[PDB]
Design an enzyme around this catalytic site. Structure first.
Site: not given
Ligand SMILES: *C[C@H](NC(=O)OCc1ccccc1)C(=O)O
Length: 212
Positions: A44, A84, A172
């Site tokens: 992502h 992802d 992330c």
């Protein structure tokens, strides 16, 4: 211990950036080297923006930079469908210490449930240890992704850890580390979403590295 696993994670975390050729680099999040020239990174970070393959990917390893055309990294899935987090081979990156054996085995997943964990991550290279409350496993986790234009997309993955905790932009790509010493404080997966005091990490097992 958690802290020693955290040290191994920290040494393998690089900053992941994207930019146009001859353009300014946008530093997006972390990527985690796992073995050889392979890293784990939330896809992502790049896949929802226009013409990703025509971009340059940047990997910041403690102030030493390694760039490559997005078309020249080899992206491999962890499993069938969208998860992802992907495996990414970056030919120009220095060989990483192999930390694959520190990841949780599929069969040991239940042993991390209902126990504390630590998100070992950075915000643009500044290492952070983020406490996560007793973990649960969501068979299907859905979370929002905010694109560069401010618009959002909803992403769904299979098997994501959920823990109470406070995340910030850029975390992330960090690694979730179990507090459970009886499974040697196993790396449980990769942080993909935070918000509403909930932290979400895609499960990554040792078995997934068999995909190359
Ligand atoms: C953190 C790494 N550990 C590792 O790969 O352990 C594998 C092992 C350890 C002890 C007995 C059997 C297998 C490392 O860098 O060594």
């Amino acid at each position: 211990s958690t802290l020693e696993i955290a040290g191994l994670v920290r040494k393998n975390l690089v900053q992941f950036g994207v930019g146009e050729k001859n353009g300014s680099v946008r530093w997006v999040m972390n990527a985690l080297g796992v073995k050889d020239d392979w890293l784990l990174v939330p896809s992502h970070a790049y896949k929802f923006e226009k013409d990703y393959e025509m971009m340059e990917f940047y990997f910041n390893r403690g102030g030493t930079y390694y760039s490559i055309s997005a078309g020249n990294v080899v992206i491999q899935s962890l499993d069938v469908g969208f998860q992802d987090v992907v495996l990414m081979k970056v030919p120009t990156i220095p060989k990483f210490r192999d930390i694959t054996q520190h990841f949780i085995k599929k069969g040991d997943v239940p042993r991390a449930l209902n126990r504390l964990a630590t998100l070992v991550t950075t915000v643009n290279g500044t290492p952070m240890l983020i406490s996560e409350g007793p973990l649960k496993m969501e068979e299907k986790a859905t979370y929002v992704h905010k694109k560069n234009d401010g618009t959002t997309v909803d992403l769904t993955v299979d098997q994501a850890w959920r823990g109470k905790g406070e995340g910030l932009p850029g975390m992330c790509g960090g690694a979730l580390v179990s507090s459970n010493q009886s499974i040697q404080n196993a790396i449980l997966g990769i942080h993909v979403a935070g918000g509403n005091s909930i932290l979400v990490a895609k499960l990554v097992t040792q078995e997934m590295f068999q995909n190359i």
